[PDB]
């Protein structure tokens, strides 16, 4: 079969597969560029246009995206540099975790599947944080960046796009509800950004509520909601009021408590007190 990992596409090859980048092939504009669906060389792909100058530092950051290899990361099939930057990722037929949890049309995710998806996502971020030196950071961990396949397994998407945008152009970076206090207010960058954002994802798996809760014009975070649920006389009853109503009562209360306790540690104000992604993996494995 194929031994090479990435393929350098050509501009003419990408334009033909997307009808010269027509609006029909355009599947997304989630930020930092637009996304196009494409069928490239016997595979369903997703072309992500990014407007960046092709500097050597930009290419060095592009090598990090083409060299990473993990089952819990969405595969970067190829890239294209002629003109602007085009990133070709593998296509996951089922949507992201946010569409499963906060959306209707798909059957409710079983609790065991949520423990599996959380563990799958944690292993993907652990690989990012520990595979090389200096430490690399995803910088935009959120439910929409966790893709689910037909087997209900997790894959982290859009890794390194933040760094590529910043080095190519050297809210700015991040999603509301997923930013730690030291980054949202002061821009302090560290791997604890992803740990904090992951804790919110655990909160979403428990509650199926958005990171920013939907009186009006005043936002309230899901992190604050768990603070009010677990720091009360009966922490178990406060947590039971928060669990996804779609799950009904089909969940181990102790296992959901342990995941909520894990999200608490991830969402601490002091980033030094947050656990590493490695500790989160070993902690999630005791629930699976
Ligand atoms: N590799 C992929 N396979 C399948 N669907 C994808 C893939 N990448 C993106 N999508 C879908 O396309 C949409 C476009 O958004 P995406 O490009 O993922 O950015 P986002 O999640 O909206 N936020 P940002 O990372 O800030 O741009 C997503 O919401 C996914 O549903």
Swiss-Prot record:
Protein name: LysM domain receptor-like kinase 3
Primary gene name: LYK3
Annotated source species: Medicago truncatula
Domain of life: Eukaryota
Gene null: resulting phenotype: In the lyk3-4 mutant, increased nodulation in plants infected by S.meliloti, mostly resulting in tubular infection threads, and, to a lower extent, in sac-like structures. The weak hcl-4 mutant is unable to form curled root hairs, a step preceding infection thread formation upon infection by S.meliloti and leading to nodulation. In the hcl-2 mutant, S.meliloti induces extensive root hair deformation and continuous curling, but is unable to induce the formation of tight root hair curls and the subsequent infection threads.
Binding annotation for ATP: 27-35, 48
Tissue and organ expression note: Expressed in the epidermal and root hair cells of the developing root hair zone during nonsymbiotic growth. Accumulates in roots and nodules during symbiotic growth with rhizobia. Localized at the cell periphery in a narrow zone of about two cell layers (e.g. L1/L2 zone) at the nodule apex upon infection by rhizobia, from the meristem to the infection zone (at protein level).
UniProt subcellular location: Cell membrane; Vacuole lumen
Post-translational modification: Autophosphorylated.
Its job: Putative receptor for S.meliloti Nod factor signals essential for the establishment of the nitrogen-fixing, root nodule symbiosis with S.meliloti. Involved in the control of root hair curling after S.meliloti infection, probably by modulating the reorganization of the microtubular cytoskeleton in epidermal and cortical cells. Regulates a subset of Nod factor-induced genes.
Family recorded in the similarity comment: Belongs to the protein kinase superfamily. Ser/Thr protein kinase family.
Assembly and interaction partners: Forms homodimers and homooligomers. Forms heteromeric complexes with NFP at the cell periphery in nodules. Interacts with PUB1.
Cytoplasmic-facing ranges: 1-288
Effect of residue 33 to E: In hcl-1; S.meliloti induces extensive root hair deformation and continuous curling, but is unable to induce the formation of tight root hair curls and the subsequent infection threads
The Protein kinase domain, residue ranges: 21-287
Full-length numbering of the shown residues: 302 to 596 of 620
Active-site annotation: 140 (proton acceptor)
